[PDB]
């Protein structure tokens, strides 16, 4: 019947594959997959095994995601699946040259490879994405943080982790799928049936993040066939929106990586106007310095609607939003004797919102208040920071008297926003409040004048406040009026 990996799957678009050599005569991909003249490998059916399978995962007639998709093959990996960063750069330059020659259309570059962090390789992925190319990469199979690998750590690419038939992260001995804040989502990557290079009609079962990345590249090609004018920012938000939620048991991931790793498994639901799409981005850990700073930015074509912070020990000095390069950035502050903090941003697709920060200095009275007053402006997030070591109406941000309050005011006449709260007197470990159905979470914070708060972060449409008066989780929920 239909293989398990295709259960969640329901025009001038090219899919470039930078892999090993492929067996183009295979019945699954023949006529649709073109072999380019490109070859740059460090030095016969085992040579074609990896590339043939992945071409079959993307555009396979029987076992493919995007059945009958047009592909173009480049050889950057030898017979043993080994390549170089330099050989990969020349392959990416070959695509840029081909993009200028071939007719204008959506380009998908599948990079089912991984090396260590490479500055030149991530800069090359940045150059292509600025030219309108959708890059889909593998997270790696090292049971490690994908931020240490390239092109997985490139902010402009779509990094894909691997899950099995039970939606659990893939384990292969002492190894398995990579994880972390650099991963966008997960996709089927274990026991994946596809084209075998042994015979022209043979099938083989393979596993890895390469199979998971080929699955997402298949979904992206189907999205770009129906809507050829989709940007990378619009395409990334849809992959997140269409994903299966909370189906991965996070216990497989290390404890410090559970909050950073997205619990998303790739899907393509039945098709079925403008709606608000938001996602969470995590900054790198700031460090043990008392004056260290964690900075979280949003992707180009995206708007930062809120900023939050988190510390595993709770020794922090809050966060703030500030204008930098004509856009808002999330900046978290570490306390004196703190191990470091994370800056957590809320990245949304809200065109021409021109979000501005409105700050009220610490009033030091009975507390600190600020609101959005402009015409057609809505409150999307509340941030607060304090310079002290130890502290002692709707459409409004409320902070501690010794702290400076910040409000994100976005010009969006089509949005209606509301505040939803939930308080617990003696919290065990966390306080939770979620937005209702049809609503999109834009901001997650905690009420001040509280004993011990580790931090706050948004997980999909749920505001999560970490704890160690009732501790209250405050959620700002927005939606389109239609």
């Amino acid at each position, epitope marked *: *019947s*239909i293989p398990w990996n295709l259960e969640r799957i329901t025009s001038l678009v090219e899919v470039y594959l930078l892999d090993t050599s492929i067996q183009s005569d295979h019945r699954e991909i023949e006529g649709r997959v073109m072999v380019t003249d490109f070859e740059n490998v460090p030095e016969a059916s085992k040579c074609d095994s990896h590339g043939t399978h992945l071409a079959g995962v993307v555009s396979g*007639r*029987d076992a493919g995601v995007a059945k009958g998709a047009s592909m173009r093959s480049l050889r950057v990996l030898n017979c043993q699946g080994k390549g170089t960063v330099s050989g990969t750069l020349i392959g990416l330059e070959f695509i840029r040259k081909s993009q200028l020659v071939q007719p204008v259309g959506p380009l998908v570059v599948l990079l089912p490879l991984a090396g260590g962090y490479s500055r030149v390789l991530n800069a090359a992925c940045q150059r292509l994405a600025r030219a309108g190319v959708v890059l889909v990469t593998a997270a790696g199979n090292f049971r490690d943080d994908a931020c240490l690998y390239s092109p997985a750590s490139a902010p402009e690419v779509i990094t894909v982790g691997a899950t099995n038939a039970q939606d659990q992260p893939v384990t292969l001995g002492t190894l398995g799928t990579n994880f972390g804040r650099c991963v966008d989502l997960f996709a089927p990557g274990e026991d994946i049936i596809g084209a075998s290079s042994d*015979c022209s009609t043979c*099938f083989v079962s393979q596993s890895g993040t390469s199979q998971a990345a080929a699955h997402v590249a298949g979904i992206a090609a189907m999205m770009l066939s129906a809507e050829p004018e989709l940007t990378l920012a619009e395409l990334r938000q849809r992959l997140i929106h269409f994903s299966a939620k909370d189906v991965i048991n996070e216990a497989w991931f290390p404890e410090d990586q559970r909050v950073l790793t997205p619990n998303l498994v790739a899907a393509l639901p039945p098709s079925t106007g403008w709606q608000l799409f938001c996602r969470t981005v995590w900054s790198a850990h700031s460090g043990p310095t008392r004056m260290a700073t964690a900075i979280a930015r949003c992707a180009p074509d995206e708007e930062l609607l809120s900023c939050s912070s988190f510390s595993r020990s709770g020794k922090r000095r809050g966060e703030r939003m500030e204008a930098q390069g004509g856009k808002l950035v999330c900046r978290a502050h570490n306390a004196f004797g703190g191990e470091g903090v994370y800056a957590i941003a809320r990245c949304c697709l809200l065109p021409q919102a021109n979000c501005s920060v409105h700050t009220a200095p610490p009033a030091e009275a009975s507390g600190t208040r600020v609101h959005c007053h402009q015409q057609g402006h809505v409150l999307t997030g509340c941030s607060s920071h304090w310079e002290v070591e130890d502290l002692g109406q709707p459409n409004q941000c409320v902070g501690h008297r010794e702290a400076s309050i910040h409000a994100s005011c976005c010009h969006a006449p089509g949005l209606e926003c509301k505040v939803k709260e939930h308080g617990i007197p003696a919290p065990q470990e966390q306080v939770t409040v979620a937005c209702e159905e049809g609503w999109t979470l834009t901001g997650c914070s905690a009420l001040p004048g509280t004993s011990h708060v580790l931090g706050a972060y948004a997980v999909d449409n749920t505001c999560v406040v970490r704890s160690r008066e009732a501790v209250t989780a405050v959620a700002i929920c927005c939606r389109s009026r239609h």
Partner: antibody
Amino acid sequence: EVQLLESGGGLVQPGGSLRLSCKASGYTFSSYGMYWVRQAPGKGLEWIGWIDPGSGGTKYNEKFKGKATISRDNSKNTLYLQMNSLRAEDTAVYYCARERYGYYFDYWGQGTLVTVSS
Amino acid sequence: EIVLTQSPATLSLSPGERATITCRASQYVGSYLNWYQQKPGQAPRLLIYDASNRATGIPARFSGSGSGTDFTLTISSLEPEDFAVYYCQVWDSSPPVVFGGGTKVEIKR
């Protein structure tokens, strides 16, 4: 039209060898793969070997390794078979079949009976 | 290796009645399965290719179905010349070809 003319059938002494041919016509002989398949009466289809008339590349069934040999002559579009040290279990109707790479067996021989008896 | 299991071994039906023969692959083979018909004293004849396509010169009563592991050969109305032996066939790697065991279709009186 595509025709596959077989020859070399008859009686073989036990311990002796069968020597069959398959003359092909109506197509470019190198563009298609060739097989030797046999069938004992009442039993099913048992493949013997394969050859690529372009490369000369061959494959054989493990049960016939060392006993079976397949060769070709592209100048006369003829396929060849030799199966040594025959026993009474080797009595079967032998076929030569053309394969369309990755598709099917489109053309067959008429069927050649080989009986092994002393 | 792939093993093709055919069910049943012998199918006894009356002329005009519908016939269904099953071929089961031990592994995923996609839709690259072929059906052959063999009448006595004759070589096998290509009937269905790519699990659903009728071969050139095959009557419309013959139809194939399936993808993956389960395959079905269907004869809408049994004509008296349709009572023969049927074989399913796929390609593989270690042995380059795999044939089914065979299914004999018998007239029922």
